[PDB]
Amino acid sequence: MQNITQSWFVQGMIKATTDAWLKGWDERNGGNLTLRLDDADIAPYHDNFHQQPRYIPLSQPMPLLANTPFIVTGSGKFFRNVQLDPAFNLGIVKVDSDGAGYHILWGLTNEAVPTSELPAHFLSHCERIKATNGKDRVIMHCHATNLIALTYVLENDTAVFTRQLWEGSTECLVVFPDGVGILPWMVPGTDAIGQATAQEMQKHSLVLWPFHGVFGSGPTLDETFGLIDTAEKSAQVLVKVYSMGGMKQTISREELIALGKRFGVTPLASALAL
Amino acid sequence: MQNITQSWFVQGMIKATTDAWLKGWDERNGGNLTLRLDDADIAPYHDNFHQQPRYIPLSQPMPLLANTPFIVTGSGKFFRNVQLDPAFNLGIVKVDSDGAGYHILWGLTNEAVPTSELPAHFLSHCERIKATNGKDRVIMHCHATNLIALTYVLENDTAVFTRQLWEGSTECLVVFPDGVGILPWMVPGTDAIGQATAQEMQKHSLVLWPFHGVFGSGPTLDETFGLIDTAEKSAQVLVKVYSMGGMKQTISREELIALGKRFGVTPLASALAL
Amino acid sequence: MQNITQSWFVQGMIKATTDAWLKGWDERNGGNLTLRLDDADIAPYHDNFHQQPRYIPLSQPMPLLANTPFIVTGSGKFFRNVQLDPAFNLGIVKVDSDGAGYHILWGLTNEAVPTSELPAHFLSHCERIKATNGKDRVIMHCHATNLIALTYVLENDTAVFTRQLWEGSTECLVVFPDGVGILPWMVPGTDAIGQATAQEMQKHSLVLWPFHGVFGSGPTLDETFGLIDTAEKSAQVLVKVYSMGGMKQTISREELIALGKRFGVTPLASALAL
Amino acid sequence: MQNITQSWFVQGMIKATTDAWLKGWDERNGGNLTLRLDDADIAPYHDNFHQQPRYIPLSQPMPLLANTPFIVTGSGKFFRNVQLDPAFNLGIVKVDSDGAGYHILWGLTNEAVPTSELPAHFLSHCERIKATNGKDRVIMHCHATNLIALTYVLENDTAVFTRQLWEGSTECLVVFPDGVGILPWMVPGTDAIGQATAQEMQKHSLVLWPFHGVFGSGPTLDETFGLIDTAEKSAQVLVKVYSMGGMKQTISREELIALGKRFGVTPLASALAL
Amino acid sequence: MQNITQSWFVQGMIKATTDAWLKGWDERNGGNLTLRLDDADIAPYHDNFHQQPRYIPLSQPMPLLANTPFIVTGSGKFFRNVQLDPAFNLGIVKVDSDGAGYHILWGLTNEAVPTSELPAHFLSHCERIKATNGKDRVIMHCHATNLIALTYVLENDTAVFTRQLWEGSTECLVVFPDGVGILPWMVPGTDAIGQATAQEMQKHSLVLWPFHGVFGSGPTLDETFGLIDTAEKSAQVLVKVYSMGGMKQTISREELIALGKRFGVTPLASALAL
Amino acid sequence: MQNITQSWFVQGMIKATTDAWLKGWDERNGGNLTLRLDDADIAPYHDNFHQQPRYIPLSQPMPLLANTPFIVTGSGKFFRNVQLDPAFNLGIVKVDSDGAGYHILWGLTNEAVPTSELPAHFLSHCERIKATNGKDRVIMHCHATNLIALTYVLENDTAVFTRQLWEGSTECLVVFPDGVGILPWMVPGTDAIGQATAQEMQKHSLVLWPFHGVFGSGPTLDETFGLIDTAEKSAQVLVKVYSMGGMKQTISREELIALGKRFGVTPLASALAL
Amino acid sequence: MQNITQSWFVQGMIKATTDAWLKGWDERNGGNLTLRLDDADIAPYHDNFHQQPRYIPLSQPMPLLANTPFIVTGSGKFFRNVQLDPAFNLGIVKVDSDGAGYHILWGLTNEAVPTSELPAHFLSHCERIKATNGKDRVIMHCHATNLIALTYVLENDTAVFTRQLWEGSTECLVVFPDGVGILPWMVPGTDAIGQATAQEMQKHSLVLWPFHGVFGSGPTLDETFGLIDTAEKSAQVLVKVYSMGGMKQTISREELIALGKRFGVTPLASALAL
Numbered sequence A, B, C, D, E, F, G: 001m002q003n004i005t006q007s008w009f010v011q012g013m014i015k016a017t018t019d020a021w022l023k024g025w026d027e028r029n030g031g032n033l034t035l036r037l038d039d040a041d042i043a044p045y046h047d048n049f050h051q052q053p054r055y056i057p058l059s060q061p062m063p064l065l066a067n068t069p070f071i072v073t074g075s076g077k078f079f080r081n082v083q084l085d086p087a088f089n090l091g092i093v094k095v096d097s098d099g100a101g102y103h104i105l106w107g108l109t110n111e112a113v114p115t116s117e118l119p120a121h122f123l124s125h126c127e128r129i130k131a132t133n134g135k136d137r138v139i140m141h142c143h144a145t146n147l148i149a150l151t152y153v154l155e156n157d158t159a160v161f162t163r164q165l166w167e168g169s170t171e172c173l174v175v176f177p178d179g180v181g182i183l184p185w186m187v188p189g190t191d192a193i194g195q196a197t198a199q200e201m202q203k204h205s206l207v208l209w210p211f212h213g214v215f216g217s218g219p220t221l222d223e224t225f226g227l228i229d230t231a232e233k234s235a236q237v238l239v240k241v242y243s244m245g246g247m248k249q250t251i252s253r254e255e256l257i258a259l260g261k262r263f264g265v266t267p268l269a270s271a272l273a274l
């Protein structure tokens, strides 16, 4: 059938990129988003897919992702432009039967390498699928401004950074009890940064890249966007607070402890111990 | 009749949540809003309400609210999404004849506990109704950013905080002469925080939760939103001022005194005395 | 998930009713439309359905329709109004496990008998499902104006009426080779008219009710609407032609024969023989 | 409060005039519509009404309409223009305490006689209120094209005209069982035509003015518009039928009888007897 | 200043052409409209006008139109397209100081003869200005469909044609008491047809061109459009009536007489006498 | 005529208030705007004005403003709401023949004192008219955020404040060479603050109220808004600069001198001398 | 043909100015944008261009730009207003056959000097065309806020400023490896600043004007806007960082080196050496 642009998932992709562009998080082509779909999501639209789609092999096969469809932003595409031309800026792809590569069924442009960052996403989808028994479906990278700024002034240490972020808005502890993972700065678009981020994604829905940005995960687009927005709201508040000379008072350790108990979550111990 | 979504009060709910999302005050599901309606408001739409609505008993009955209808945001709902699907994100409810519980007449989703925060709102509506001879109709919680930030650097003291806020924009004294109430940080969603906020609401239209957010009241959605926006505008200005090294000059006590006299309001004495 | 109104099938229902209102075919509450859905269509929206939906038993069970979901216009609803309030004017229903009745999962108003015409539709869906090996999914009734007018002047005879309609636009023969079924006038909303229409639906995708309107079937909303529009376009042309004193020339029998052969359809013999 | 233009009843007025303009029924300033409101409808908008409104006395007081508010089209206003400037083209009025006259609370322009046709409407509202125990609230005049045309060729006789209209679409008998009232042509805007129409309105929801137009009544705007549209749809079909040389077959008397019995209405006897 | 497209008079031009395109009256480039403006209308927009505008001399000077501005449709422009590109399809022009020619201040395209029909319009504006003491400001030509059709079957005689049109809707007599002027068919775009139409415009706001269309005048765009629409509504009704075999009854002479008296107009005697 | 809401000046009022609300400058009812119109602007709309308008006398007559019309925001109105209901939130007024008072011709609500701040505006319009030979037409008050913040940290001295603002963006000197006037804090809405601001307006298009906001003037809405936006852009940059520890380098006096010479303006000497 | 406003390049101009206005970068008339087009871009619209266009000679001819068309913002035009009236605020121009001057084919207003800044743009287009073998087509000036602020606190030295900007977001090095050029403050609109900027444009796509703004270049509007937005995003982050007391850690020299190698760019040596 027609109107694929108005499908729930193309509409959701437009919402999340547009929202992020409006937040100031995705200058130029900075940012990427992919969403894991089910065959039944795309089946009504078969009509629209190439009879002979482009195939791109993967360097490390991912059999966990076999026969799995996704919608994704193209590499080099601007979040700002997605609402204006969804088909030019998004692609629907499907991993083949042994996960040795993927076919581009719909969307995007005719270049060599329209989805350069997709191998890195796939690696992280795998870890998140194992970590959550198949609940996580989204991987989102953006350049969340205050979170970036904090990476120049806070210790680049999971425990220290998580603790400040929890302190900066009450609900953070409940939204990311497992804390934010962190990496040293690394060269973007490399195997190493892909593998290293995926390893952090084993124990974190949210990972910081210092002097660059954030990488997050969730079961739905709303939940992923809302995770990033919550930590970035904290960061925004902390930037103000530090800029005014630092905390005179804050949430105390035993207050953070009682928060986790009431909401039934177990907070990252290292961050609590501070 | 049909078009309930276009009714004055569903349209007002969409306006206030949308406005607050755009201000940056309601990340994720952070925020709640309820508005007290009259039977005549909803009577034309009876057509649309469940013949057998869900009933939720209250832990402490509220006979002052007997047979009273309200429109409300669901728990877990995102302010951002209200404009996109008013019926999914809002509910119309009605307190039964002895105020022992409430029925969900319209809207929201099918979960256990679609309106978790409504008991706390009701407690505060009661106090505001007594405090204003029935003029206040709205209770609004949001995460007003600069007000949050100030809770890490200013003394958490009604008099001190009120005085800075009055100084930060001229008209604040006239808009909230009774000052802002404050509480210690407390675990959200608990009886204690509900009761404690309601007790502050006896003498304040506006109450701060440190490291979390604000809770405000008013006769209309515009007036409530406009109360919060005014104090948050002050806070925004103060964040700048403190960040530049503090006040070199400001509104003086006897200037604040003359302001209250000209506009016919009596300002919180403790705040004036500073 | 939210945005059920923007789902492909609610959007399709709005398109088809709106289009028909604009054609002049559905004055007041004249007209009905139902579309057979699959479980996977509505599964993403489960969120929105009543935990305790209304049950309406059927007078004659239909086990062929067991566990089958549909979207439908309410009885008494105006096609014109569907675009303005989809949820008030449409309902999603699901036939129970032995086809003894149906539950209203979503939409419509709180009256006794919100879907009076649904038993008649179901009977015809059954015949169309058997007749097409499960391809037909839509049943649509509207008051197609020129087709109505022709029922006062043409012989109320399948063969005669089909032949004029084929002659009135070239492509009609290919679109409905099996011809239009016809009934004597009967009292609307009765078992008899329901059963009699369903019996015509055994051999026809399109059935005339003299002095009243048309009843049609198809695999998609577009195809059903387009079937009715094609026969009503023919009728419109014939009204003009008869009004100008009748045909001086027309499509000849052996031309209609060659048409069926080229397009690979076998035309109703009785209509060809004229 | 503000947004009176978006109130349910101003929105309904815009819908009904716009719909009628699109049907081709209201050239120039041809047509008028008034809707009886309740005090509670306009009470939220008091804010917007003149402190010293214009008063227009009535020639014959109507105490049945005492203290009753209405929304109305201005005299000389074009249906086409209502959607473009609701406030210029509509007025809200209120009949005083002994029904000796009315005040214009809102809308319309500053001329002498902005609502020339309102006395005639009021007379008919009175009869319809008595005739329906207060259910009818709308009086609508438009120049329904095919109904006008039929007044040059059919006998200007209630029984004869009603019978043709019933025959021209099946559901007409059920929608107006009491038939259409008719008057001789009379000079428009006169007491006589006002009184004479009101007298027909004692026993008819729908009244024909030969060579001019129709005058109808109903409990809601949708129901009134839908009554006129149904009879005008019949007329449209009959114009076609007569233009093709007349009925070869039609609905028979005993078929019309069975229709009234099944739907529980008693049809105008004189029309049945034909 | 900017936004000239949103000025009242460009907006009015878009409304009237668009409305006429939707009525079916202006296929292709069939139709023309010009509106006489005042200097104060265009003065705020001076900003937008060519410093060196194109000058087109007139064959017969019109000193009555000296220094007078107008907005106009270009020759060869499609009514349908005006809403899509007002500036391409409309022009603002101004007659020079002794009425020997006109300058194109704004709009239209760069061809030889962008306003071919403007001399003919000007001649008719002159007569209408003299005839109405300066009240008429619009000249509008369109191909009103039923009025065209009637020119093949009715006597091409002012009195006969006026009388049928008055009979075809009650209010026609009041809207055009002076009747419709008529001409023999003539070759379009010629001096003769221009002069002959202007001479009819001495005593008529509305003039028929047989087998072609209508030419009308009024003080405002609404009033002119509404004059044409009223006579074309009559014609539409008469086409139906004649098509059904002619009038069985109609408005009688003494009824038409009483109509003119009540509304204070003196009807064309020749038409009354029939 | 109708469509007054779409007139150039109501549209301009909506643009300027909406723009200012979006900038964050007009919380609640904070802000006021008035624009001086000409009789010819409102003359086409006479149709819409009260036959008996409300009269409000002035305490000090202003014969310079005799017979002068203005469009204005109501007191207590929210800038945010103007786009939603222009007529509720704006008023058109006209000063009587000896400038002893004004009549409200259109718009606003029915209270005592719908335009409380208009006397103060009028006083300043007078001074600006004398100061610019009748070129200035707008007076605008808003709570420009960074300009407010700077009033707590910079010396409240015309010369010092002007100099920083010139330094903070290159073009400021050219946009306001005469500098910004300043007052001590004063109680708002008083004669004294009205008179004192008007006296500053003798030599300044822009005046600061410490701890409150700004008051500016210009020949058009765009030019006034653009003056305030330019100084507030400077302030925004300075807030950043001061917050980072102050200027390391800046525009030098002799650079500011050369700027004024090149653009042909004479800069406030006191500010240059610093 | 018509619809020139909807052409790809007028639509692109509206997008880029509107986006920049929304970013807060173009107060009042601050900013300019020009885009080099090809003859084939404008050829379909020839229809719309003046038969006798205004000619403006250049002071220094530019034969490299001979016969070259451009679309441009007018001098004195507000970025904010472009979306509201593209034709008033943009112009299409074409350089004559020996590059001695240019003709204004379309758009803009009738003043002396509608494009004051175009000579300066042309000089820079020339250098960018030589520098990139004809790939660059855009020159854009705006007042990027955080970049302006940084010019008061950072050393005004290409190497130092480039290095901070690279450090402030990872991808900056890849987006502008050649670094940002800088000039001393100079008087705007002068030959000297025009020539000096063009000389920087020999080796830089991006040039800072201290205390004023930025001047950038690119092959497309998106790429140019995205270059400025990227450096301004860095600046925004640095303002925060410096405001919080400076970097505790950052991207290291050998990390910046490895970045350039991986992406295949050679970074400005002077900036690397720091």
Ligand SMILES: [Fe+3]
Residues within 6 Å of the ligand: A158, A180, A181, A182, A203, A204
């Ligand atoms: Fe970790």
Ligand SMILES: [Fe+3]
Residues within 6 Å of the ligand: B158, B180, B181, B182, B203, B204
């Ligand atoms: Fe207190």
Ligand SMILES: [Fe+3]
Residues within 6 Å of the ligand: C158, C180, C181, C182, C203, C204
């Ligand atoms: Fe058959």
Ligand SMILES: [Fe+3]
Residues within 6 Å of the ligand: D158, D180, D181, D182, D203, D204
């Ligand atoms: Fe009767």
Ligand SMILES: [Fe+3]
Residues within 6 Å of the ligand: E158, E180, E181, E182, E203, E204
């Ligand atoms: Fe004549």
Ligand SMILES: [Fe+3]
Residues within 6 Å of the ligand: F158, F180, F181, F182, F203, F204
């Ligand atoms: Fe001064």
Ligand SMILES: [Fe+3]
Residues within 6 Å of the ligand: G158, G180, G181, G182, G203, G204
């Ligand atoms: Fe350089």
Ligand SMILES: [Zn+2]
Residues within 6 Å of the ligand: A030, A031, A141, A142, A143, A212, A213
């Ligand atoms: Zn990145």
Ligand SMILES: [Zn+2]
Residues within 6 Å of the ligand: B030, B031, B141, B142, B143, B212, B213
């Ligand atoms: Zn909260």
Ligand SMILES: [Zn+2]
Residues within 6 Å of the ligand: C030, C031, C141, C142, C143, C212, C213
């Ligand atoms: Zn039917």
Ligand SMILES: [Zn+2]
Residues within 6 Å of the ligand: D030, D031, D141, D142, D143, D212, D213
């Ligand atoms: Zn009428």
Ligand SMILES: [Zn+2]
Residues within 6 Å of the ligand: E030, E031, E141, E142, E143, E212, E213
């Ligand atoms: Zn013509």
Ligand SMILES: [Zn+2]
Residues within 6 Å of the ligand: F030, F031, F141, F142, F143, F212, F213
């Ligand atoms: Zn103020």
Ligand SMILES: [Zn+2]
Residues within 6 Å of the ligand: G030, G031, G141, G142, G143, G212, G213
């Ligand atoms: Zn500049």
